[PDB]
Amino acid sequence: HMLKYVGVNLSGAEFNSRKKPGTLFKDYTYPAASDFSYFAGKGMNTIRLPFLWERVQPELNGPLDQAQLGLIKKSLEAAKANKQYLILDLHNYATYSGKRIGTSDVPAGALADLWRRLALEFKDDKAVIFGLMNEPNGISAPDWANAAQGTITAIRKTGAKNLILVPGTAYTGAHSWRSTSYGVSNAKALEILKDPGNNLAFEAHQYLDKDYSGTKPVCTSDSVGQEKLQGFTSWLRENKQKGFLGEFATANNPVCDKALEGMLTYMEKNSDVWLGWTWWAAGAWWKPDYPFTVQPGKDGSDKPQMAILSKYA
Ligand SMILES: C[As](C)(=O)[O-]
Ligand SMILES: C[As](C)(=O)[O-]
């Protein structure tokens, strides 16, 4: 891989998000150790690990749940053992128990407290990357940027030097990064961020179906992925920043495979600003008909898209 960090999302800990706390192995799961070794064997050195704010911190501004933290630490041991980096993905869409950040119920400061606590736990660890928030939405780009700044600050106040992945609002889509249709763009709002630790990258997501939601197993053309990454890539370059494609996926068909090759090659050619990517998704709890799974079969076999991802790893 020409990019620094390449891998997959190991999805499962974020499942059944309405259930709080939920029960391990019934409502959600953490990944098997064997998942980490399988992907390591494919050349992948990075795992994005979704988990829920509500499960790791059952009361806002309160102590972390030690059982939940122990599960995260167990996954970290597996990643380290397999020479992988672990992205802690607070997989919450800028909400806590259904309420948006910025409301009276969930002040921006509550997210900063969460991250202060995780940073204190993981600061002495080079394998750990902090994924501040999965797909913020329902919040303006300036407001989200204020929340993100508060969180970066809280992390750095602990002495933590770990890489922080910072998303925008609008589900952090690469394609819409520069859009001013509805007001201030992610591009404009996030220009003012400061990281006194100088170890930040911007996380974008990109799907290739008609509304870029990953709702359908269709790629609208054989070049749409690379096309949708261009604006964001230029913004990174303009601002001397790095980027990370925290989620992307393509279905198993010829037009999608071409689009996937094109977007992976595009990020390789633009590796001055692309730090890496993590495919959505693997993990043991996807049904076999889920169009984007790269979880190996019960029979040990590789999924179709893995043959392409492995080439770029
Ligand atoms: C896999 As998603 C687009 O809900 O972060
Ligand atoms: C969470 As999805 C819309 O990429 O299956």
Measured between its terminal Cα atoms, the distance across the chain in Å is 4
d(CA 24, CA 44): 27
Of 249, 150, 171, nearest to 208 by C-alpha is 249
Count of CB atoms situated within 10 Å of the CB of 91: 22
Kindly give the number of the ligand 1 atom that is closest to the alpha carbon of 280: 1
CA torsion angle 88 110 235 256 (round to 10)? 50
Q: Three-state DSSP class for 47?
A: strand
Count of CB atoms situated within 10 Å of the CB of 313: 21
Report the CATH number at residue 65: 3.20.20.80
Q: Is there an atom of ligand 2 within 6 Å of 246 CB?
A: no
d(CA 171, CA 175): 10
d(CA 301, CA 258): 22
Q: What is the β-pairing status of strands 128-131 and 85-90?
A: parallel
Which residue's structure tokens are 């309405």?
A: 18
Ligand nearest to the CA of 215: 2
- Rounded to the nearest angstrom, the distance between the alpha carbon of 245 and the centre of ligand 1 is 12
Domain range for 155: 1-313
CB 175 within 8 A of CB 230: no
Whether 247 sits among the annotated catalytic residues: the reply is: yes
- Rounded to the nearest angstrom, the distance between the alpha carbon of 193 and the centre of ligand 1 is 25
Of 23, 26, 44, nearest to 35 by C-alpha is 44
Structure tokens at 212: 């870029």
Kindly give the number of the ligand 1 atom that is closest to the alpha carbon of 214: 3
Structure tokens at 126: 């080079």
Structure tokens at 232: 């964001």
21, 30, 282, 300 from 26: Cα distances, Å: 11, 11, 18, 24
60, 90, 95, 96, 201 from 105: Cα distances, Å: 9, 18, 10, 9, 29
Q: Is there an atom of ligand 2 within 6 Å of 279 CB?
A: no
What's the count of helices (H) and strands (E) in the chain, helices before strands? 9, 10
Q: Which of 14, 121, 135, 203 is catalytic?
A: 135
Which residues, 6 or more positions from 92, have their beta carbon under 8 angstroms from its beta carbon?
A: 52, 53, 54, 133, 134
Q: What is the β-pairing status of strands 95-96 and 99-100?
A: antiparallel
d(CA 203, CA 174): 9
d(CA 113, CA 116): 5
CB 295 within 8 A of CB 44: no
Structure tokens at 52: 């829920």
Report the Cα 136 to chain-centroid distance in Å: 11
Q: What is the β-pairing status of strands 85-90 and 99-100?
A: unpaired
Kindly give the number of the ligand 2 atom that is closest to the alpha carbon of 215: 3
Report the Cα 194 to chain-centroid distance in Å: 21
List phi, psi (to 5°) of 236. Answer: -55, -45
Which residue's structure tokens are 């997501």?
A: 205
Q: Could you say which DSSP state residue 160 is in?
A: -
Of 29, 2, 31, 90, nearest to 294 by C-alpha is 31
Of 235, 241, 206, 293, nearest to 8 by C-alpha is 293
Q: Is there an atom of ligand 2 within 6 Å of 211 CB?
A: no
23, 176, 246, 259 from 88: Cα distances, Å: 20, 24, 11, 28
Of 219, 210, 203, nearest to 277 by C-alpha is 203
Report the Cα 14 to chain-centroid distance in Å: 12
Q: Is there an atom of ligand 2 within 6 Å of 221 CB?
A: no
Question: How many folded domains does the chain comprise?
Answer: 1
173, 187, 227, 230, 274 from 179: Cα distances, Å: 10, 8, 15, 13, 21
Of 112, 39, 43, nearest to 75 by C-alpha is 39
Which residues, 6 or more positions from 277, have their beta carbon under 8 angstroms from its beta carbon?
A: 3, 5, 6, 7, 244, 245, 246, 248, 264, 267
Of 79, 97, 69, 96, nearest to 10 by C-alpha is 79
- Rounded to the nearest angstrom, the distance between the alpha carbon of 238 and the centre of ligand 2 is 31
Q: Is there an atom of ligand 2 within 6 Å of 280 CB?
A: yes
Kindly give the number of the ligand 1 atom that is closest to the alpha carbon of 135: 5
CB 48 within 8 A of CB 278: yes
CB 36 within 8 A of CB 47: yes
Of 52, 113, 62, nearest to 88 by C-alpha is 52
140, 204, 286 from 135: Cα distances, Å: 13, 9, 21
Q: Is there an atom of ligand 2 within 6 Å of 244 CB?
A: no
Q: Is there an atom of ligand 2 within 6 Å of 103 CB?
A: no
- What element of type H or E holds 86? strand 85-90
